[PDB]
UniProtKB/Swiss-Prot annotation, chain B:
Protein name as it appears in the record: Nitric oxide synthase 1
Family in the record: Belongs to the NOS family.
Gene: Nos1
Record note on what altering Y281H does: 50% decrease of nitric-oxide synthase activity
Binding site for (6R)-L-erythro-5,6,7,8-tetrahydrobiopterin: S36, V370, W371, F384
Assembly description: Homodimer. Interacts with DLG4 (via N-terminal tandem pair of PDZ domains); the interaction possibly being prevented by the association between NOS1 and CAPON. Forms a ternary complex with CAPON and RASD1. Forms a ternary complex with CAPON and SYN1. Interacts with ZDHHC23. Interacts with NOSIP; which may impair its synaptic location. Interacts with HTR4. Interacts with SLC6A4. Interacts with VAC14.
Residue positions binding heme b: C108, Y399
Record's comment describing the protein's domains: The PDZ domain participates in protein-protein interaction, and is responsible for targeting nNos to synaptic membranes. Mediates interaction with VAC14.
Included stretch of the parent chain: 299 to 718 of 1429
Length: 407, 411
């Protein structure tokens, strides 16, 4: 019931007690581990509010204070009457920061306390959401000196008045299925792109077209908006040694801004809460560029390098992979856009993990997601045992709005 | 109950029913996943259902379930258990059991080969000298002048737990490690403790960087005895690089035969505490883990210097770059010397095909993603994108405590 994690490279053992606070279910059982699976009322509400308010008030050294008891009383009174309750600004900020802190799949959590929270609960329309999102993008981008931020739209009421950003990220490239059978652009984004077109987006049918925003306010029908091109910082990708690399025509955007997750705080649900940090290089160079179902550029790069691609054992894929990732890091650095390499990031996570065990009694972490998609065991996280469990406040997945939307 | 797994690269969805036959626990609960944790005397009481479960599986597999032979065998085993408190497997049952322990090993990426396993029955062995002879024969058979053949040698099962057969080595062939007074380590740091034990037991150590350790063998619960594997039986491969001529001057080599000797084999409730087995290497085991783990030979820097990479900032990916070149060299050297080896691309590709075949023919394939995904270039191999279900089936290979921690010394 008191759990130990070992690092097999350093022999450092840490003891976890934080897991006992856990409330949500993992998907695993005593008979089966599902660690590698990607997606495993007033009565409901008050214990959740109470649980949250208790940790909030404990965080500010006022547990068992009159202010705590008063707040609990007021929220309770508000739940009985209104069926829901409104978070104080202090509580919302605490909750958002803690959702990030609790994100067991996030390697960048050493940064968790430095998050700019934009309260957009006064938003009523999709043009309003657009304005808030442009402001987030500009603030977060900061001319390449990225700053973590989240923008929080009104909370779910009855489920028929949901605010939703339909895009999976604020900035992402379109995908088009060709008659020649191939895929133009980002294969990941074909279905959403088509939905943009149905709703009226006039597509330029390129390889790197920044998608428009599809914004849904108050459970109303979603509307299209285009982000000002001047607010979308992008980076042409070149290699510090291969002069030919720029001829590949590759580029990526600076700001990773995830917009399809659900933020849960004190039982309240925020279905539209786009957030952003900065990239770890492997997200672009390994996954975006080299996944077979993404831009899948390994073959092309390999050929330009004149590698022996006859046999797997020449490790031509591995060689090309490293070079692509060198170029990504080189390009962002050269243009002064914040990025972190997988070595620095994982090294930071180990130190964060040790802080959290020391100061909080643990750190929920999903090894399958924390270990980078290249060079796993030369990063320190590979050798670090981790316990995965679900704490609240949390970021959750939610269904894509189109499957759900009553048009 | 049906469980689905999805491959996120192909959208292929598989359905698992085999997990229903799982009996043993994982370590996980509905509240916590322990998927990344490395390590999360039996009564006639518990023993007969274990034997019966196993014999039902064996007899089903030979399409003789419910036959007179099946029924008679159950009866024979029950009587043997109640009268002798244990039982003896038939040779056929032993071979089936050893093959299935491998088939069931959720951490093994090489399972496409599971049905091709040479089983050596060493249950008639009584002394450490006898174990040494059996082990030499295994090494020579398995090595096959570089054309490696998978094999397992099985020593007598546990009785009261006081007469255990044990191989004290973690692998039959492994390099010594020596802690120096200045805190540095010579040879393989992973083997320092075992090396000290051997030296204490009387081994005269050459004290080099690649000294093949002696076997330390325990028969019938007696104190272990030292033996040296004939050097002519130990196939080694000097590591060189196909493009970089300076690589040979690093002085690296490795042995051809990975032969794990510290696991426990469980079949039908019986426990085989000494069951050395061997296959062949996947390149990354040597080139990534043995060579580049900080706690092992740790050669990344020296290689990176020799390549003259920019080593002032990690963002140059100098470590990733040297890592690939080292792994190219390992594959190149083994192939050049005609010693069986498999690269991580081929191995993971084969594993996916194996897994899909197992889903169709068996209803599942327990697999530990944490261990199946190779320690370099993870997502450019197909296993990274494959959802897997981990659960425990028997027969199985299990961990057991190191014998020096439990052994009662006779003196
Ligand atoms: C500031 C620099 C940050 C870095 C370097 C970073 C790094 C990462 C990486 C590499 C992943 C894996 C993503 C993938 O493979 O698709 C991830 C996941 C995640 N991050 Fe962070 N992150 C940062 C900031 C943030 C912030 C500000 C938040 C929220 C406020 C956050 C919340 C999450 C969540 C919820 C996941 C899991 C996503 C999922 O399950 O799909 N991250 N992070
Ligand atoms: C024939 C070629 C084989 C290949 C290429 C192969 C590959 C591998 C690899 C790369 C690992 C991970 C090892 C580590 O990281 O420590 C592994 C684990 C394992 N293998 Fe295989 N293997 C082969 C044959 C066998 C055989 C013949 C057996 C048993 C009869 C076996 C049983 C196991 C077991 C039980 C594990 C888990 C070990 C542990 O948990 O420490 N393998 N295999
Ligand atoms: C879960 C799933 C299922 C199907 N397809 C794709 C996915 C991947 C989900 C994408 N998550 C991307 C993400 C989320 C948060 C991030 C935060 C910071 C950062 N640098 N990158 C992030 C990247
Ligand atoms: C259990 C543990 C804990 C910490 N460090 C190390 C370990 C032991 C990991 C050793 N696994 C070795 C192993 C086992 C079976 C194999 C079969 C084939 C093969 N090529 N290699 C294998 C390699
Ligand atoms: C099947 C497996 O769970 C899936 O491929 C996971 C593996 N680890 C990952 N890790 C990260 N960071 N991101 C991912 O999308 C994935 N995908
Ligand atoms: C902590 C973590 O479970 C540990 O480092 C594991 C990770 N995956 C592994 N995978 C393999 N094949 N071999 C290993 O030794 C390990 N070590
Ligand atoms: O084309 C639509 C997809 O990009 C979308 O469904 C995402 O994959 C989904 O939101 C998961 O991130
Ligand atoms: O020096 C002894 C080690 O080799 C030994 O303890 C192994 O790590 C152990 O047997 C697990 O393989
Ligand atoms: Zn689990």
């Amino acid at each position: 019931r008191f759990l130990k994690v070992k690092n097999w490279e350093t022999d450092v053992v840490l003891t976890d007690t934080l897991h006992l606070k856990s409330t949500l279910e993992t998907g695993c059982t005593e008979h089966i581990c599902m660690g590698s699976i990607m997606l495993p009322t007033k009565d409901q509400l008050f214990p959740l509010a109470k649980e949250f308010l208790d940790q909030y008030y404990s965080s500010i050294k006022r547990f068992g204070s009159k202010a705590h008891m008063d707040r609990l009383e007021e929220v309770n009174k508000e739940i009985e009457s209104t069926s829901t309750y409104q978070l104080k600004d202090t509580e919302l900020i605490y909750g958002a920061k803690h959702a990030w802190r609790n994100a067991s799949r996030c390697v960048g959590r050493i940064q968790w306390s430095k998050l700019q929270v934009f309260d957009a609960r006064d938003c009523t329309t999709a043009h309003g959401m657009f304005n808030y999102i442009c402001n987030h993008v500009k603030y977060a981008t900061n001319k390449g000196n990225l700053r973590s931020a989240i923008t929080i739209f009104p909370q779910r009421t009855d489920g028929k008045h949901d605010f939703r950003v339909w895009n999976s990220q604020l900035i992402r490239y379109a995908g088009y299925k060709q008659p020649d059978g191939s895929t133009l652009g980002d294969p990941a984004n074909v279905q959403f792109t088509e939905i943009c077109i149905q709703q009226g987006w006039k597509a330029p049918r390129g390889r790197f077209d920044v998608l428009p925003l599809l914004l849904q306010a108050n459970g109303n029908d979603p509307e299209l908006f285009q982000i000002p091109p001047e607010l979308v910082l992008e980076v042409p990708i070149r290699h510090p040694k291969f002069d030919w690399f720029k001829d590949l025509g590759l580029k990526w955007y600076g700001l990773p801004a995830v917009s399809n997750m659900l933020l849960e705080i004190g039982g309240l649900e925020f279905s539209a809460c786009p957030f952003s940090g900065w990239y770890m290089g492997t997200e672009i160079g390994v996954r975006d560029y080299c996944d077979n179902s993404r831009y899948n550029i390994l073959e092309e790069v390999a050929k330009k390098m004149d590698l022996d691609m006859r046999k797997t054992s020449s490790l031509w894929k591995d060689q090309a992979l490293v070079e692509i990732n060198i170029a990504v890091l080189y390009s962002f650095q050269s243009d002064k856009v914040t990025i972190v390499d997988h070595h620095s990031a994982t090294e930071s996570f180990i130190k964060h993990m040790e802080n959290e065990y020391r100061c909080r009694g643990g750190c929920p972490a999903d090894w399958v997601w924390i270990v980078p998609p290249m060079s796993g065991s030369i990063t320190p996280v590979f050798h670090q045992e981790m316990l995965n469990y679900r704490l609240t406040p949390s970021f959750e997945y939610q269904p894509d709005p189109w499957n759900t939307h009553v048009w």
